[PDB]
């Protein structure tokens, strides 16, 4: 298999790195690397970037998709606004998750909270060819 | 090809199982297995789980992504809040679709309504390797 | 590699076609092919279809996913409501992007603005087999 490198920033010291729960899992949970003893408030309708404290080194030919956690979405109405968030093999910034509160309650973000799931996949670049002149894709 | 198993729960008796429309289709439409003669009201801003009455047996090495239907999104402002919803090869619960109404009208959910599309894909687990020290992925 | 065909409609004359920035990129940016000298207003909570002026000829065995741009989502609260938007190999309509404003400001859509990213991927159709009787997928 391919290898996903992960560089831990200081605020991710002490957290478990992402890992697959079982051989059957599709994604890895990502955790909030916010300050200990700090509760971040996300009010209804509002969005924020939540740090993971991780830099991903995704190898050439692959991507990471940042997808929502299903339980947060149901219980709280929280999702990832840019879902599926695309992280490419060039990206060497810190991975941050863009949460939006689409529910009615104030939501509290805490250190260690599972905030998204990451799915690693091959990516391909087709040749792009201009040509001259039902299917899914229309509205 | 791989085979996707589907176990039908009682409330899905009488509905067509998911199927690809053509050899070209990417997804399969999923239908609401709500009670006959019941109109479920989803008001603006609100979310709910819609039952499909299906248990998926996804084989090892594959996942299912639950994606929005484009026409509902356009016409009604309805989408899947946890999109793309990840269903892994361990999951043996009933598949439910988390709809949210991000439009202005009351939306009615009825038995048999197409509510999402399912895409079946291989999934890979890279080795996860901690390492020490523009690209898509930042904001 | 596979080849993605692109037929340019009249309103896309003069725009750069989608292209990968680097060998590492996962997606291609898509641009608004709206009229020059026209600012389209997308108010908070509202959604609209934004034309690209492109018809995609995706080859059999592949799909295109229309995903949000991360910067628009962060800066403006704009996303693609039907994300990831599925375009299959049968679809020969114009590709339009369904933007929704989930922020607080009026958003202006202008000709040439990058409005989404397209990811090209293989797609598979498993055999669908009904069978009789934790994992990601529940809520």
Curated annotation (Swiss-Prot), chains A, B, C:
Q: Which domain of life is it from?
A: Bacteria
Keywords from UniProt, A to Z, are:
Hydrolase, Magnesium, Metal-binding, Nucleotide metabolism
Q: Single GO molecular-function term?
A: dUTP diphosphatase activity
Q: Which Pfam families match?
A: dUTPase
InterPro entries in the record = dUTPase, dUTPase-like, dUTPase-like_sf, dUTPase_trimeric
What is the protein's known function? This enzyme is involved in nucleotide metabolism: it produces dUMP, the immediate precursor of thymidine nucleotides and it decreases the intracellular concentration of dUTP so that uracil cannot be incorporated into DNA.
PANTHER family tied to this protein: DEOXYURIDINE 5'-TRIPHOSPHATE NUCLEOTIDOHYDROLASE
Which HAMAP family does the annotation name? dUTPase_bact
Protein name as annotated: Deoxyuridine 5'-triphosphate nucleotidohydrolase
Q: What is the lineage of its organism?
A: Bacteria, Pseudomonadati, Pseudomonadota, Alphaproteobacteria, Hyphomicrobiales
């Amino acid at each position: 298999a391919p290898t996903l490198g992960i560089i831990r920033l200081e605020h991710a010291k002490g957290l478990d790195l992402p890992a697959y729960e079982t051989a059957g899992s599709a994604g890895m949970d990502l955790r909030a690397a916010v300050a200990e003893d700090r509760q971040i408030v996300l009010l209804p309708g509002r969005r924020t970037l939540v740090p993971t404290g991780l830099i991903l080194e995704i190898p050439q030919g692959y991507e990471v998709q940042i997808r929502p956690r299903s339980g947060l979405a149901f219980k709280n109405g929280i999702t990832c606004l840019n879902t599926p968030g695309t992280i490419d093999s060039d990206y060497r910034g810190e991975v941050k998750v863009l949460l939006i509160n689409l529910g009615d309650d104030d939501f509290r973000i805490e250190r260690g909270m599972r905030i998204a799931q990451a799915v690693f996949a091959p990516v391909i670049q087709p040749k792009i060819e201009e040509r001259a002149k039902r299917g899914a894709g229309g509205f």
